[PDB]
Amino acid sequence: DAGASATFPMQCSALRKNGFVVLKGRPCKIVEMSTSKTGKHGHAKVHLVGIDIFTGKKYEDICPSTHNMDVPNIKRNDFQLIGIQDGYLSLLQDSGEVREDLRLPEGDLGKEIEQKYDCGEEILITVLSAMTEEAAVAIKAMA
Amino acid sequence: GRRPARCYRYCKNKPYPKSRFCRGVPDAKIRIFDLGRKKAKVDEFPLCGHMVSDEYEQLSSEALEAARICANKYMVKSCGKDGFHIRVRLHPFHVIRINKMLSTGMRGAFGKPQGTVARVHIGQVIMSIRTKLQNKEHVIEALRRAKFKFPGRQKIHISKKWGFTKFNADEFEDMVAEKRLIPDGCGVKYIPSRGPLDKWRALHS
Amino acid sequence: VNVPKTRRTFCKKCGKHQPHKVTQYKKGKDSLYAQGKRRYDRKQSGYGGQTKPIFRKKAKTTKKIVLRLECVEPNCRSKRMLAIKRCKHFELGGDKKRKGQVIQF
Amino acid sequence: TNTKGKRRGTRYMFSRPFRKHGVVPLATYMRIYKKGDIVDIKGMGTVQKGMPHKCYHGKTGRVYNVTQHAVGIVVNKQVKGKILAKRINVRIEHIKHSKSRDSFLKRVKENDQKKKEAKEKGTWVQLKRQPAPPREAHFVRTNGKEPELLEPIPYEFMA
RNA sequence: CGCGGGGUGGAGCAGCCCGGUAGCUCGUCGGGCUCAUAACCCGAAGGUCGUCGGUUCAAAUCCGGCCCCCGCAACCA
RNA sequence: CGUAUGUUCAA
RNA sequence: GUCUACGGCCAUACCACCCUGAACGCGCCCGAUCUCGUCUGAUCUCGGAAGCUAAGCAGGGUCGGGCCUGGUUAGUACUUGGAUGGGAGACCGCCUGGGAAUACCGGGUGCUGUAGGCUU
RNA sequence: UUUGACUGGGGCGGUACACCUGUCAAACGGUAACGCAGGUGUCCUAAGGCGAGCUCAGGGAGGACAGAAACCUCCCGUGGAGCAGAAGGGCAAAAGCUCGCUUGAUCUUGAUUUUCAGUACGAAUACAGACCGUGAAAGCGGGGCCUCACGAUCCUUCUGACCUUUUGGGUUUUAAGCAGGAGGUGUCAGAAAAGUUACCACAGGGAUAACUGGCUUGUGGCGGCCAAGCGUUCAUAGCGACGUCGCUUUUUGAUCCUUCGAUGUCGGCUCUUCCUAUCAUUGUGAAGCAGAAUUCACCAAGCGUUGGAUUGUUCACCCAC
């Protein structure tokens, strides 16, 4: 458990339309960046809005170009699915272990996952862990 | 377009060759450095004329191209399209820079490549023409015309060497008879009286 | 960085190399009765607003890992803090590196 | 502004000479260094331990301490407007005996020895060195041969 | 001369990000159905991932040059 | 539940 | 005259191809029980003594390559200090001292320490 | 109440703000720019430590499927490979590779080097005292082959002593100490910090921009030299490509020397004078000058160069003389 904080310090103006940012204590992904130098001759400010990494809730913020913004730490990995019990998906590790914790998504995504499992084919889901919570938000298949 | 050549006449900077530290250099104006009958055998063109620089200056690639064309054109008129061989002895390896000033100041002024020049020394040969002896007057006259494409003073010197080789013309024939100068295409190969005796055997076989 | 859960290193109380149980040091809970905290609460009392600086310009993206080494001798349960260099990823007793094996994509 | 790097600018300084790379010849370690002798510091890039700093390469110092693999040397270092006697530890791979001190020490023995024979023989042997005196008078025999006449050569344009 | 966003089957666009396997819709082609066309049904083919290098065991992906196409900025006298 | 169309003249 | 063991300097010793090698040695060489180690007694380790200098190795050779050294290059290039020197400049000459590097042309081809051996 | 700094004015931008490699740098060392080419905030239980064996990149030849490319063998192979990363240096019975064992990346006091004020931090060098690893042993090793990879006071937190104090004494909790780590200040010797002002203010500054003048002349304008070519033919009547040499300050840039206790800013209007690189007019030379017209050139600035529509316009454009 490295001491490295989930909070990662980085500038604001050096953030693009792909970068991950934490807005109002919420991990977010940038969806729009427009700078603006008010005053005849003053500091330019950057206006940026990030849609959440887990929720779809957009988040908006205004920061001086020079100012710095926290960047989140993401642990991403995709594991194949074996079994669904009581809403708790059973997953398999490359280490060889099986943890049946987490949960299926609470929307159209989660339902679409389980029906694939019921049919039975190349299935493996990603595990996104930021801060303290977790969300399985992606699907993949072999070829 | 190009700045006037007066802006890059003097060897003011250290050599700045096209290298891994200098990218995006436009190709030099001059590409063909040898023209005429390059294949002619060493013994066909004994007379050699050189244009020698009398200043320590920079000659642009465009300047080298214009003189090459000017000398070539006249030599075809006076001796024939195959009565000589012209070699430009300067290759533009020095990259000159330009700090493009388009309507900020001298901040970050280190320029971008603009072209290439050939840093010439006092007495360095600029271009050489080898032909038959009967065409000496034309080679001086052809080299006289090419002088007007260069800045500074140039001198035309008829070399006492044989053709484009480094051996004196008055003794070139003797060394060839004694097998110390084997004709090797354009030039000759010097046969040192050393090395395995087998090589001496073949030569005299 | 992988560090084993155990290592044989010098024990100050034993005066000799002993096996040591290696864990990761974590900061304790602030006492709230520490002199510095008792002063801070007394200073912040009443009006005046914030009386001490609040550091904001964070720049470090790592921390120095401190290992809590404990002597395994039952009569000497001595602990010593040993710090290693900054690292983004740290695990105790991870699976060791092997050579000449397939990547497994 | 340059870097403060400890080995900046030592590309050629600490490089090995051409065709002199590889194993360090062992007479280097067989040399004996005692307190008080004079050593030339010359860092060698093959051995990265006990390196002298670049400011001490080409400097000459006096040994004041001897250890298992290294010696303590007192070297004069000019710091702006003052010279400091710096005590540096360098492994013996980067030093060698100053031949100048060895030549002088030989002359002291020779002077002291020569003085003893000057007493048992009267003669006065010169001990102090003398700057090259003006050449004494001499004759120069032509040996019949008239001196060759030299003339400047005509200019020839060699291009 | 700056800053950013892109170039991926015939068209539009994912994949990038988040190195291991190029996909969606439409179109194209072949066979049904129909008297015939479309609609509908069953299938199939199709991409140098702008180009050149580098990293890597492995590059559409990471990094660096060049080309192309689009936006932003250019203020106080 | 849910589909549209059928080039010009010509008995 | 020369070897072996351990070397110092580390090509004047290296590299290619060749000729020769008495003696002792060093080798190759024979074998795997033991010691030891290998897919393989090839290597490594061990036990030997039928054969051979074929090889290694040693000495020599070669208008040999390399290397070392000298000449030439050349008082040339460059350079310390100097001038109310020249020249529009670029640059150049002089005075005062220092002084290189190719190509090209010769010569050389290990020296040596300690200990032990061999050569009527 | 704050709203950093550097800066060829300031803002935008960049970080040249803390560092590392090669260069600049002028053969000790030191040496600047918003100089050039790059790199850093990491990575590693081995990629640390020791020992052992081994030799790499590449190429040639050969060998079932097997081919440019799978694996096996021989030969050549001074390193043309690899050593985490940028680069430079270093390294071949190794510093590379493979294997075995390990925790010298441990505990402790000083000295020294680097930056340097010769302070600190960081990093490093050589020892010493313990306790260990490895190897038969010599020996090597207190992190990474070397040159970067990091952080004061206060505070907090943890670890060590049958430790000191906790205030009249005693026991216990608690709190405070001493020593060593960590939590971090990247503006990296380390404030806790958003804008606007054309409604503006003060102290100043020609240390510093906007106008004038100066230097410069890329750019703008004008001229020459050579002569491929154009010119029914014919380089040069008139032209002049590829090149190349200049002049001017009538454009714009570049610079910031003068002026910020003030040199009134554009344009017009009015008025004088001056320059010539001559449009006309006087005298001429040349023609691809029959005449007329036109073009080129010389002496030449004496004299003249206008009336209006649109535009604040300089500039344009058109109408008319």
Next chain:
RNA sequence: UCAGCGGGGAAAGAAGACCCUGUUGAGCUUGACUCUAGUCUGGCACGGUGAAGAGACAUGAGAGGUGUAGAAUAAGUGGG
């Protein structure tokens, strides 16, 4: 010396308003930092007399299946 005149005195008037610098301000703004009037809300007191209700918590039973197989797997979860 007189009347004029407006080329020059980089004429006078004013410690440049522009611009920059100052670890100098002020007017205004806000997602700047730190506060605050007010306001919302909870608690304690003033704060009393009746009446009828509820919840949590702990203690012990003896029950809690059901498309399915068994014919009650009360529901699981182990050692079995």
Next chain:
RNA sequence: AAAGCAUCGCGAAGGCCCGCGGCGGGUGUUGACGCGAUGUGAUUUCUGCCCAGUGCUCUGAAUGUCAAAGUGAAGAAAUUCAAUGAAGCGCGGGUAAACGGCGGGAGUAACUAUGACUCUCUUAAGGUAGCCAAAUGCCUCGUCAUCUAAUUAGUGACGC
């Protein structure tokens, strides 16, 4: 500013506001045809789409957060730990005459051109009725017509 238009709060224990303070004071000698707070600006004709964002507002069964006081448990006590859970926030709904916002690429008609038509990406919605080189258009002195001998002007038209 204005009439006109629209929106918002409030039934008095109230709305809006004053005030250091007195449940003091203004509106108020008032009572929704009133008072208070905003926008727009006569009349005429219209006032489209968007509740994703930011406001505002409604709701509070219930989960997630959530202070002081209280309650419990351990302890010699200081103290610690737990349970409990106000408003607010979060969660959900409404609201644009609240602040405000209102899209790209490609193909296509039997001359050509163009494109009613179709494909595809995509938004909260993709600028509707209108109007225009406008006191609002860089390019620009836009293009056409008119006005003049001549128009960077004017006017009419056109509108990616």
Next chain:
RNA sequence: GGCGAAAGACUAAUCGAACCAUCUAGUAGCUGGUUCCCUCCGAAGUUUCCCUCAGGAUAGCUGGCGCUCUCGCAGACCCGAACGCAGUUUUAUCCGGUAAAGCGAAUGAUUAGAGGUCUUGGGGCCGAAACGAUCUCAACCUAUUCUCAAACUUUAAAUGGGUAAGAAGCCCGGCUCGCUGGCGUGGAGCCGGGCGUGGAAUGCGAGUGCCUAGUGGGCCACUUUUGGUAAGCAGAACUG
């Protein structure tokens, strides 16, 4: 605060916060000024750190005060009877990678022709059923050849940097050690004695402490040198 049909308008010539007194001689890294004479010495615009860049702290450069020593004589008259150092050379020795040079030496760049020709490809021809024959052009190899390098180099200067040129030396005898060790071995230290030709030239008297101001905007020239077309331009080295 008022008041404003709203211009930040008006509120006693005052308004984007009136006027009066006080706090208050408010603070200013900023501008200006800073008063007699002579005498002697006499700078700095550079280093490091600083929310530092118009300022400071720091070292340097300065002055003042000293102190510690060295150097005197033949004579009332006349008359003889070195402590140490250095903006320098010399001698010895070490250091270096610039100038130049080099590329038929590595690395990188680069022009031409020649000869081979195993293989590799193409053109083309015979053959043409099949290989096959044959020629050419390339690639490839070999020997040559043109031209180059701040971030290349085998070589390699000039100028330059360090050190040494004795009495703290040398020579001989002895002793101590817990270090080292086959060995009174090695090393170091201590004690006693002996030895002056003061062991290159030239010049000069040195050593040492305290207190300390101003400065910390620089600018120019030769030569070297970076950016820039260039600049009475911007930035360095060296000495003046």
